[PDB]
Scaffold this motif. Structure first.
Motif, PDB file in Angstrom:
ATOM      1  N   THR A   8       0.824  -1.202   0.000  1.00 29.52           N
ATOM      2  CA  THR A   8       0.000   0.000   0.000  1.00 29.52           C
ATOM      3  C   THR A   8       0.863   1.258   0.000  1.00 29.52           C
ATOM      4  N   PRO A   9       0.685   2.098  -1.030  1.00 34.03           N
ATOM      5  CA  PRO A   9       1.438   3.349  -1.171  1.00 34.03           C
ATOM      6  C   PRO A   9       1.037   4.387  -0.129  1.00 34.03           C
ATOM      7  N   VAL A  10       1.965   5.280   0.197  1.00 36.67           N
ATOM      8  CA  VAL A  10       1.708   6.327   1.180  1.00 36.67           C
ATOM      9  C   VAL A  10       0.975   7.504   0.549  1.00 36.67           C
ATOM     10  N   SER A  11      -0.261   7.727   0.984  1.00 33.67           N
ATOM     11  CA  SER A  11      -1.072   8.821   0.458  1.00 33.67           C
ATOM     12  C   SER A  11      -0.714  10.138   1.142  1.00 33.67           C
ATOM     13  N   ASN A  12      -1.029  11.245   0.478  1.00 35.60           N
ATOM     14  CA  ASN A  12      -0.741  12.568   1.020  1.00 35.60           C
ATOM     15  C   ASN A  12       0.590  12.574   1.764  1.00 35.60           C
ATOM     16  N   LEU A  13       1.676  12.381   1.023  1.00 38.84           N
ATOM     17  CA  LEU A  13       3.011  12.365   1.611  1.00 38.84           C
ATOM     18  C   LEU A  13       3.318  13.689   2.303  1.00 38.84           C
ATOM     19  N   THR A  14       4.575  13.870   2.692  1.00 35.88           N
ATOM     20  CA  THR A  14       5.000  15.092   3.365  1.00 35.88           C
ATOM     21  C   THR A  14       6.427  15.463   2.981  1.00 35.88           C
ATOM     22  N   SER A  19      11.193  18.851   8.555  1.00 34.42           N
ATOM     23  CA  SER A  19      10.665  17.531   8.883  1.00 34.42           C
ATOM     24  C   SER A  19      10.723  16.607   7.671  1.00 34.42           C
ATOM     25  N   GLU A  20      10.889  15.313   7.928  1.00 35.46           N
ATOM     26  CA  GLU A  20      10.961  14.325   6.858  1.00 35.46           C
ATOM     27  C   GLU A  20      10.245  13.038   7.257  1.00 35.46           C
ATOM     28  N   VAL A  21      10.076  12.139   6.292  1.00 37.19           N
ATOM     29  CA  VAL A  21       9.407  10.868   6.541  1.00 37.19           C
ATOM     30  C   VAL A  21      10.244   9.698   6.036  1.00 37.19           C
ATOM     31  N   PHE A  22      10.298   8.631   6.826  1.00 40.34           N
ATOM     32  CA  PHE A  22      11.063   7.446   6.458  1.00 40.34           C
ATOM     33  C   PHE A  22      10.280   6.174   6.768  1.00 40.34           C
ATOM     34  N   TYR A  23      10.533   5.126   5.991  1.00 39.99           N
ATOM     35  CA  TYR A  23       9.850   3.852   6.179  1.00 39.99           C
ATOM     36  C   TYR A  23      10.752   2.687   5.785  1.00 39.99           C
ATOM     37  N   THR A  24      10.355   1.480   6.177  1.00 42.05           N
ATOM     38  CA  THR A  24      11.125   0.283   5.867  1.00 42.05           C
ATOM     39  C   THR A  24      10.215  -0.862   5.437  1.00 42.05           C
ATOM     40  N   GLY A  40       1.704  15.713  -7.673  1.00 40.90           N
ATOM     41  CA  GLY A  40       1.679  17.156  -7.830  1.00 40.90           C
ATOM     42  C   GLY A  40       2.918  17.684  -8.526  1.00 40.90           C
ATOM     43  N   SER A  41       3.818  18.283  -7.753  1.00 41.13           N
ATOM     44  CA  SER A  41       5.050  18.839  -8.303  1.00 41.13           C
ATOM     45  C   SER A  41       6.265  18.344  -7.524  1.00 41.13           C
ATOM     46  N   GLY A  42       7.439  18.460  -8.135  1.00 38.92           N
ATOM     47  CA  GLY A  42       8.660  18.021  -7.485  1.00 38.92           C
ATOM     48  C   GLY A  42       8.886  18.704  -6.152  1.00 38.92           C
ATOM     49  N   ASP A  43       8.492  18.038  -5.072  1.00 39.00           N
ATOM     50  CA  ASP A  43       8.654  18.588  -3.732  1.00 39.00           C
ATOM     51  C   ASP A  43       9.280  17.562  -2.794  1.00 39.00           C
ATOM     52  N   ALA A  44       8.884  16.303  -2.954  1.00 34.95           N
ATOM     53  CA  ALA A  44       9.409  15.227  -2.123  1.00 34.95           C
ATOM     54  C   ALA A  44      10.234  14.246  -2.949  1.00 34.95           C
ATOM     55  N   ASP A  45      11.497  14.078  -2.572  1.00 32.62           N
ATOM     56  CA  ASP A  45      12.390  13.169  -3.279  1.00 32.62           C
ATOM     57  C   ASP A  45      12.282  11.755  -2.717  1.00 32.62           C
ATOM     58  N   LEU A  46      12.697  10.775  -3.513  1.00 30.58           N
ATOM     59  CA  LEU A  46      12.647   9.377  -3.094  1.00 30.58           C
ATOM     60  C   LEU A  46      14.034   8.745  -3.141  1.00 30.58           C
ATOM     61  N   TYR A  47      14.412   8.082  -2.053  1.00 30.54           N
ATOM     62  CA  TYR A  47      15.714   7.432  -1.969  1.00 30.54           C
ATOM     63  C   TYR A  47      15.565   5.960  -1.598  1.00 30.54           C
ATOM     64  N   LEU A  48      16.474   5.134  -2.104  1.00 36.41           N
ATOM     65  CA  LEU A  48      16.446   3.702  -1.826  1.00 36.41           C
ATOM     66  C   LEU A  48      17.860   3.145  -1.694  1.00 36.41           C
ATOM     67  N   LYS A  49      18.074   2.323  -0.671  1.00 34.55           N
ATOM     68  CA  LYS A  49      19.379   1.720  -0.435  1.00 34.55           C
ATOM     69  C   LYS A  49      19.233   0.300   0.102  1.00 34.55           C
ATOM     70  N   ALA A  50      19.703  -0.672  -0.673  1.00 32.36           N
ATOM     71  CA  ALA A  50      19.628  -2.072  -0.273  1.00 32.36           C
ATOM     72  C   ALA A  50      20.409  -2.319   1.012  1.00 32.36           C
ATOM     73  N   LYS A  87      12.716  13.166   1.436  1.00 33.11           N
ATOM     74  CA  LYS A  87      13.207  14.493   1.792  1.00 33.11           C
ATOM     75  C   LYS A  87      12.492  15.572   0.985  1.00 33.11           C
ATOM     76  N   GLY A  88      11.972  16.578   1.681  1.00 38.05           N
ATOM     77  CA  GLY A  88      11.271  17.659   1.013  1.00 38.05           C
ATOM     78  C   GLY A  88      12.026  18.972   1.086  1.00 38.05           C
ATOM     79  N   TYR A  89      11.703  19.889   0.180  1.00 38.11           N
ATOM     80  CA  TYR A  89      12.360  21.190   0.142  1.00 38.11           C
ATOM     81  C   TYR A  89      11.506  22.251   0.830  1.00 38.11           C
ATOM     82  N   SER A  90      10.209  21.980   0.937  1.00 40.30           N
ATOM     83  CA  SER A  90       9.283  22.911   1.569  1.00 40.30           C
ATOM     84  C   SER A  90       7.942  22.240   1.848  1.00 40.30           C
ATOM     85  N   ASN A  91       7.348  22.569   2.990  1.00 38.07           N
ATOM     86  CA  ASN A  91       6.063  21.997   3.376  1.00 38.07           C
ATOM     87  C   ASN A  91       5.171  21.792   2.156  1.00 38.07           C
TER      88      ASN A  91
END
Length: 101
Positions: A8-14, A19-24, A40-50, A87-91
Protein backbone atom coordinates in the motif's frame (compact mmCIF):
# COMPACT_ATOMS: atom_id res chain seq x y z
CA UNK A 1 4.86 5.21 13.82
CA UNK A 2 5.19 2.08 11.70
CA UNK A 3 7.16 1.12 8.59
CA UNK A 4 5.20 0.93 5.34
CA UNK A 5 6.19 1.18 1.67
CA UNK A 6 5.23 -2.04 -0.11
CA UNK A 7 1.72 -3.28 -0.88
CA UNK A 8 0.00 0.00 0.00
CA UNK A 9 1.44 3.35 -1.17
CA UNK A 10 1.71 6.33 1.18
CA UNK A 11 -1.07 8.82 0.46
CA UNK A 12 -0.74 12.57 1.02
CA UNK A 13 3.01 12.36 1.61
CA UNK A 14 5.00 15.09 3.36
CA UNK A 15 7.99 17.22 2.40
CA UNK A 16 8.78 19.77 5.10
CA UNK A 17 11.96 21.82 4.69
CA UNK A 18 12.92 20.49 8.11
CA UNK A 19 10.67 17.53 8.88
CA UNK A 20 10.96 14.32 6.86
CA UNK A 21 9.41 10.87 6.54
CA UNK A 22 11.06 7.45 6.46
CA UNK A 23 9.85 3.85 6.18
CA UNK A 24 11.13 0.28 5.87
CA UNK A 25 9.86 -2.71 3.90
CA UNK A 26 10.98 -5.87 2.09
CA UNK A 27 9.90 -8.15 -0.76
CA UNK A 28 8.83 -11.80 -0.84
CA UNK A 29 9.46 -12.92 -4.42
CA UNK A 30 11.63 -11.63 -7.27
CA UNK A 31 9.49 -9.67 -9.73
CA UNK A 32 10.18 -6.97 -12.32
CA UNK A 33 7.80 -4.03 -11.94
CA UNK A 34 8.00 -0.29 -12.63
CA UNK A 35 6.66 1.91 -9.84
CA UNK A 36 7.12 5.63 -9.19
CA UNK A 37 5.83 8.39 -6.91
CA UNK A 38 3.90 11.53 -7.85
CA UNK A 39 0.72 13.52 -7.37
CA UNK A 40 1.68 17.16 -7.83
CA UNK A 41 5.05 18.84 -8.30
CA UNK A 42 8.66 18.02 -7.49
CA UNK A 43 8.65 18.59 -3.73
CA UNK A 44 9.41 15.23 -2.12
CA UNK A 45 12.39 13.17 -3.28
CA UNK A 46 12.65 9.38 -3.09
CA UNK A 47 15.71 7.43 -1.97
CA UNK A 48 16.45 3.70 -1.83
CA UNK A 49 19.38 1.72 -0.43
CA UNK A 50 19.63 -2.07 -0.27
CA UNK A 51 20.36 -3.07 3.31
CA UNK A 52 20.76 0.23 5.15
CA UNK A 53 18.97 3.56 4.81
CA UNK A 54 20.05 5.97 2.03
CA UNK A 55 21.48 9.36 3.00
CA UNK A 56 21.39 12.80 1.38
CA UNK A 57 24.67 11.82 -0.28
CA UNK A 58 24.44 8.02 -0.29
CA UNK A 59 21.86 6.34 -2.52
CA UNK A 60 21.37 3.09 -4.42
CA UNK A 61 18.44 4.08 -6.63
CA UNK A 62 17.55 7.53 -7.97
CA UNK A 63 16.77 8.85 -11.48
CA UNK A 64 18.18 12.19 -10.36
CA UNK A 65 15.00 14.25 -10.64
CA UNK A 66 13.30 17.07 -8.73
CA UNK A 67 11.36 15.80 -5.73
CA UNK A 68 8.33 13.81 -6.85
CA UNK A 69 8.43 11.90 -10.15
CA UNK A 70 11.83 10.62 -9.04
CA UNK A 71 11.73 6.83 -8.77
CA UNK A 72 13.66 3.81 -10.03
CA UNK A 73 12.58 0.64 -11.83
CA UNK A 74 14.54 -2.57 -11.26
CA UNK A 75 13.86 -6.24 -10.53
CA UNK A 76 14.38 -6.55 -6.77
CA UNK A 77 15.28 -9.97 -5.37
CA UNK A 78 13.87 -11.37 -2.10
CA UNK A 79 16.35 -11.62 0.75
CA UNK A 80 17.57 -8.04 1.11
CA UNK A 81 15.87 -5.45 3.31
CA UNK A 82 14.87 -2.21 1.58
CA UNK A 83 14.83 1.21 3.24
CA UNK A 84 12.84 4.36 2.43
CA UNK A 85 13.75 8.03 2.76
CA UNK A 86 11.62 11.04 1.81
CA UNK A 87 13.21 14.49 1.79
CA UNK A 88 11.27 17.66 1.01
CA UNK A 89 12.36 21.19 0.14
CA UNK A 90 9.28 22.91 1.57
CA UNK A 91 6.06 22.00 3.38
CA UNK A 92 4.16 20.20 0.62
CA UNK A 93 1.85 17.19 0.83
CA UNK A 94 -0.26 15.32 -1.71
CA UNK A 95 2.18 12.81 -3.19
CA UNK A 96 1.79 9.04 -3.50
CA UNK A 97 4.85 7.00 -2.52
CA UNK A 98 5.31 3.32 -3.37
CA UNK A 99 7.97 0.61 -3.63
CA UNK A 100 9.45 -0.38 -6.99
CA UNK A 101 9.77 -4.14 -7.43
Amino acid sequence: GNVLKNNTPVSNLTGNKGSEVFYTFTVDRNATAVVSISGGSGDADLYLKAGSKPTTSSWDCRPYRYGNNESCSVSAAPGTTYHVMIKGYSNYSGVTLKLQY
